[PDB]
Design a protein around this ligand. Structure first.
Ligand SMILES: [Zn+2]
Length: 307
């Protein structure tokens, strides 16, 4: 509430608290953390990115987004925890410190603010955006099927009323296009991590196609390493692989896009749990989730700094 050291990371928060949090952090670490507004949501809400940087030019950067699907509360929660952790770990952990001395981190805690607010206000299990309009009474797009990455192919629905609606055209959703522009403009993203829940997976491209990425040996071994790292804290067991092989065909995803932009280290996480609680993961599992998922993320970041 009054500082980041006072903020309760062991409970779920509303939009206002998370935004206020972003302010506390910037005020507390002005030299390390910048808050960027890369857009406005459908309903006019600021869309915020925290930039972690130790200086430099347009340093190679890591993208991390969380909460694109609004009901996956664990992701927005982890996202706050990560932001704190960056500020804590800088100069303490030799490994993290070497990362930030050379690379920037862009962290998007609430990718889908409208959906988030709606999860608090009306429907806890809402996952889409809240864009309206057309020949429908149904609101919102699945923002993780809206990307220009086999957009409108099988693995996404052309019904507005669908929970997996892909939207009218690739990048129709402002929450998406804001990221696109942002990353395309920067031009020096080396890794790109989208954070989801649940089912305990680490995935690399493709979803939309059976085609094997050229970098699959490398991405596989990376995925292996990060899953090993993650399981070291509490024993939490992930599976890993390409989306289409592990999960299902899915078109218009985050990772397919970024990898097609030449960002090689394009990974999606699906956090806890395995179905016991689902989207409604107990607040008592926030910190343990955040802590292990850090070890998984750190691993990738390290690989990245290294190649
Ligand atoms: Zn999701």
């Amino acid at each position: 509430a009054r500082s980041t050291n006072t903020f309760n990371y062991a409970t779920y928060h509303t939009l206002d608290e998370i935004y206020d949090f972003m302010d506390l952090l910037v005020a507390q670490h002005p030299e390390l953390v910048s808050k960027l507004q890369i857009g406005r949501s459908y309903e006019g809400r600021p869309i915020y990115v925290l930039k972690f940087s130790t200086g430099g030019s347009n340093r190679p950067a890591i993208w991390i987004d969380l909460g694109i699907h609004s009901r996956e509360w664990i992701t927005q929660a982890t996202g706050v925890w990560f932001a704190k952790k960056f500020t804590e770990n800088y100069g303490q952990n030799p490994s993290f410190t070497a990362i930030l001395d050379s690379m920037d981190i862009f962290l998007e805690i609430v990718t889908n603010p409208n959906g988030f607010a709606f999860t608090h206000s009306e429907n806890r299990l809402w996952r889409k955006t809240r864009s309206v309009t057309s020949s429908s009474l149904c609101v919102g797009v699945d923002a993780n099927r809206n990307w220009d990455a086999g957009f409108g192919k099988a693995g996404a629905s052309s019904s507005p009323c669908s929970e997996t609606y892909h939207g009218k055209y690739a990048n129709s959703e402002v929450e998406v296009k804001s990221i696109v522009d942002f990353v395309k403009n920067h031009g020096n993203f080396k890794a790109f991590l989208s954070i989801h829940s649940y089912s305990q997976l680490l995935l690399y491209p493709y979803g939309y196609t059976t085609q094997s990425i050229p970098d699959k040996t490398e991405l596989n071994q990376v995925a292996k390493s990060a899953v090993a790292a993650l399981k070291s804290l509490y024993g939490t067991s992930y599976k890993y692989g390409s989306i289409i092989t592990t999960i299902y065909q899915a078109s218009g995803g985050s990772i397919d896009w970024s990898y097609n932009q030449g960002i090689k280290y394009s990974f999606t996480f699906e956090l806890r749990d395995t179905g016991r609680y689902g989207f409604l993961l107990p607040a008592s599992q926030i910190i343990p989730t955040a802590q292990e998922t850090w070890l998984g993320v750190l691993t990738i970041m390290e690989h990245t700094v290294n190649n």
